Write a protein that binds this ligand. Structure first.
Ligand SMILES: CCS(=O)(=O)Nc1ccc(Oc2ccc(F)cc2F)c(-c2cn(C)c3c(=O)[nH]ccc23)c1
Length: 108
């Protein structure tokens, strides 16, 4: 669990890395529903999640294990797939970032 949670910090650090920035940047912070004018976002997405919130939960030792960390990462992606139409550019970006996560998560 302790070394597992250190590995999860490594995965999140890679997701924040410069080489993935072109598709990862919309996931860096909570979706700003007000600034973006997404008036129905909170109605559709009951549990918003983003990379800064996951980073804070890891630092606060809120995750019991890798499975709990992985569930929040998958929630962030699931929210994006649920809210948006399948052809939305942000959905294409979420899948590219999910490619990064799934590889690392499966090999830990
Ligand atoms: C850093 C968080 S922020 O809120 O500070 N910045 C920000 C700015 C633009 C955004 O939108 C797009 C981003 C890239 C595109 F290629 C198309 C977009 F429309 C979003 C955004 C993020 N997510 C998960 C969604 C989503 O799920 N649907 C709609 C919008 C968004 C967030």
């Amino acid at each position: 669990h302790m070394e597992q949670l250190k590995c999860c910090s490594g995965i999140l650090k890679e997701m924040f890395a410069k080489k993935h920035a072109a598709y990862a940047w919309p996931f860096y912070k909570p979706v700003d529903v007000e600034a973006l004018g997404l008036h129905d976002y909170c109605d559709i997405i009951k549990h918003p999640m983003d990379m800064s919130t996951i980073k804070s939960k890891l630092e606060a030792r809120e995750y019991r294990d890798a499975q709990e960390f992985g569930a929040d990462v998958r929630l962030m992606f699931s929210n994006c797939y649920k809210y948006n139409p399948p052809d939305h550019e942000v959905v294409a970006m979420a899948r590219k970032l999910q490619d990064v996560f799934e590889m690392r998560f499966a090999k830990m």
